[PDB]
Amino acid sequence: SGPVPSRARVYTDVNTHRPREYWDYESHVVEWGNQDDYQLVRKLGRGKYSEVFEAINITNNEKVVVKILKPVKKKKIKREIKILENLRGGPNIITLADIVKDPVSRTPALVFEHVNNTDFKQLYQTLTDYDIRFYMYEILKALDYCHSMGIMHRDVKPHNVMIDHEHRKLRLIDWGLAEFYHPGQEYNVRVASRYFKGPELLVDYQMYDYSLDMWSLGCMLASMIFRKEPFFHGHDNYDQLVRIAKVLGTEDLYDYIDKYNIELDPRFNDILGRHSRKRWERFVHSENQHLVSPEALDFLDKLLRYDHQSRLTAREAMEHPYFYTVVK
Numbered sequence: 592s593g594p595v596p597s598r599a600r601v602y603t604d605v606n607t608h609r610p611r612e613y614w615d616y617e618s619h620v621v622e623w624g625n626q627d628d629y630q631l632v633r634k635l636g637r638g639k640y641s642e643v644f645e646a647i648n649i650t651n652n653e654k655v656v657v658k659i660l661k662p663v664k665k666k667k668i669k670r671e672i673k674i675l676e677n678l679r680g681g682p683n684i685i686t687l688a689d690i691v692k693d694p695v696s697r698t699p700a701l702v703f704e705h706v707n708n709t710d711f712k713q714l715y716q717t718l719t720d721y722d723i724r725f726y727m728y729e730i731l732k733a734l735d736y737c738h739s740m741g742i743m744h745r746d747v748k749p750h751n752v753m754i755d756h757e758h759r760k761l762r763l764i765d766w767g768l769a770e771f772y773h774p775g776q777e778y779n780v781r782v783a784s785r786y787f788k789g790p791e792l793l794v795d796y797q798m799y800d801y802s803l804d805m806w807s808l809g810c811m812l813a814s815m816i817f818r819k820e821p822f823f824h825g826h827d828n829y830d831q832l833v834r835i836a837k838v839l840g841t842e843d844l845y846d847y848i849d850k851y852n853i854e855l856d857p858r859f860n861d862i863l864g865r866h867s868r869k870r871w872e873r874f875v876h877s878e879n880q881h882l883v884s885p886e887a888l889d890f891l892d893k894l895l896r897y898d899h900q901s902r903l904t905a906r907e908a909m910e911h912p913y914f915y916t917v918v919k
């Protein structure tokens with residue numbers, strides 16, 4: 592037979608009318624800067640692809656963040672670089688300050704604007720209902736920009752969202768898994784963190800689009816307004832889909848895979864079972880009710896849907912009554 596193809600309902604042909612130089616990152620030419628301008632202060636942490644350091648730009652005494660990449664495909668590095676430069680200056684998008692050669696690692700090092708960030712561990716215990724709506728709207732501005740620029744993040748999660756709660760500044764970071772959207776193109780389903788993987792990734796559907804980020808955003812919103820991080824807490828990719836099925840039901844899951852003619856992994860036969868769709872009021876209790884509103888539930892409901900085409904776009908989401916309270 593063969594799976595039914597899909598198209599993004601918005602920003603479908605953005606890259607089709609861009610010059611090749613815009614999306615052809617394999618032929619991109621990296622403009623190298625001087626590594627001597629930066630002095631490593633302290634090690635912020637290590638990722639699976641890089642090491643992150645706090646540093647100082649000794650040419651202007653400004654504080655910066657250095658991302659020393661570990662040896663990976665050259666094509667992947669130029670992808671992150673080209674994407675960062677294309678999205679440079681956009682709303683709440685992290686600013687790529689410079690690109691330098693690290694003398695030790697012998698790999699590129701990405702220099703970013705510094706953000707006085709508080710970890711989301713202590714932060715999500717201090718956010719009011721207003722704070723949640725505000726930061727959700729700030730993220731949407733970032734997602735809508737990169738989606739309009741024809742770019743697909745594929746790793747939206749609290750860790751990739753820097754927040755300076757003092758000056759109320761937000762920055763969407765880590766565009767190493769980001770990609771250009773081309774209509775009809777199959778992508779790698781092995782993206783994003785497990786808890787934020789969309790159903791399309793879990794059922795191995797490759798022709799996805801910008802709406803993947805909207806599911807991830809929905810997972811974040813659900814964890815924040817219900818005080819349950821993460822909302823969908825599976826121990827693996829297979830159990831992850833089951834956790835989702837226990838809330839959204841299995842009947843809408845089959846409709847989803849029948850529509851796109853997707854065959855489910857046969858190992859789901861002994862673990863999925865049958866589940867009704869639950870109402871969102873179920874997860875509301877006296878400890879989080881102050882963060883919950885009818886508008887919140889309706890907005891969340893329109894984000895968390897099996898069908899990636901029936902999800903709210905970033906632009907649509909910004910029009911939702913949930914953000915009427917937000918000061919603009």
Ligand SMILES: NCCCCn1cc(CCn2nc3c(Br)c(Br)c(Br)c(Br)c3n2)nn1
Nearest residue numbers: 635636637638639640641643656703706708
């Ligand atoms: N392969 C994953 C890369 C990140 C690993 N990592 C970093 C940290 C410390 C927290 N942190 N990371 C920041 C990054 Br990346 C930027 Br850009 C900026 Br600006 C700030 Br502020 C960051 N803070 N733990 N694991």
